[PDB]
Amino acid sequence: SDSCSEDWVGYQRKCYFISTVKRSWTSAQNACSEHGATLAVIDSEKDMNFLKRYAGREEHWVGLKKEPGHPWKWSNGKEFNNWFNVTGSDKCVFLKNTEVSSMECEKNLYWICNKPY
Amino acid sequence: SDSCSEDWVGYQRKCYFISTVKRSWTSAQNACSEHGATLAVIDSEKDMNFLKRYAGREEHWVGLKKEPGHPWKWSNGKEFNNWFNVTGSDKCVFLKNTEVSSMECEKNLYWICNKPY
């Protein structure tokens, strides 16, 4: 929310939820899954811009991860159509009002969950 | 025309031109641009109905394309106000007397160009 269900944030057909605590990517992904959500899947620029300015100064985990031998896949499973490029050299994507890059999935960060409808 | 300048088709403040050969979306768009036109921009139902019955049995490219991360935009640049829904899952819109759907922009099809005045 801050710091669809009245407590989530609705935008462009998706319900968003922002954490108040930090977690590793997998752990956060697990926290999203509990609400029937997934680490934020970004399907557009409207989405990316909303999420970035909303993340704020602190970096937040989003649903883009790369497994060693496989290509980038969204937290939901759909393969990443690469409409945007992920900098860095790590396997998990994070974002903040400033940038959208990558860092080790072990890092504890705030995260953002989203789901359709 | 068939198969404003006397050889184009005028209707509702727009001059239309129908191709006799098939081309990919981009390539057709380039062919329209040469005449100072753009792949058909459809601003109404009168337009859509004219274009559909006129396209005929064969599918023709029209000016609606979706870039990976951006929303649907007309071939001229104006964003698509979505007054009608585009079926399919591809990024380029085509139409025929029967339907108005979407197909891969790589596909070679007849196309329709239009311009104002």
UniProtKB/Swiss-Prot annotation, chains A, B:
Keywords: Cell membrane, Disulfide bond, Glycoprotein, Lectin, Membrane, Phosphoprotein, Receptor, Signal-anchor, Transmembrane, Transmembrane helix. Transmembrane protein expressed mainly on T-cells resident in mucosa that plays an essential role in immune cell homeostasis. Rapidly expressed on the surface of platelets, T-lymphocytes and NK cells upon activation by various stimuli, such as antigen recognition or cytokine signaling, stimulates different signaling pathways in different cell types. Negatively regulates Th17 cell differentiation through its carbohydrate dependent interaction with galectin-1/LGALS1 present on immature dendritic cells. Homodimer; disulfide-linked. Interacts with S100A8 and S100A9. Interacts with galactin-1/LGALS1. Interacts with S1PR1; this interaction mediates S1PR1 degradation. GO terms for cellular component: external side of plasma membrane; plasma membrane; protein-containing complex. Expressed on the surface of activated T-cells, B-cells, natural killer cells, neutrophils, eosinophils, epidermal Langerhans cells and platelets. GO terms for molecular function: carbohydrate binding; identical protein binding; molecular sequestering activity; transmembrane signaling receptor activity. The chain holds residues 78 to 198 of 199 of the full protein. It comes from Homo sapiens (Human). It is found in: Cell membrane. GO terms for biological process: cellular response to xenobiotic stimulus; negative regulation of T cell migration; negative regulation of T-helper 17 cell lineage commitment. Residues 11-114 form the C-type lectin domain. This is Early activation antigen CD69. Glycans are attached at N85. Disulfide bonds join C4-C15, C32-C113, C92-C105. It is a single-pass type II membrane protein. Constitutive Ser/Thr phosphorylation in both mature thymocytes and activated T-lymphocytes. Residues 1-117 are extracellular. It comes from the Eukaryota. Induction: By antigens, mitogens or activators of PKC on the surface of T and B-lymphocytes. By interaction of IL-2 with the p75 IL-2R on the surface of NK cells.
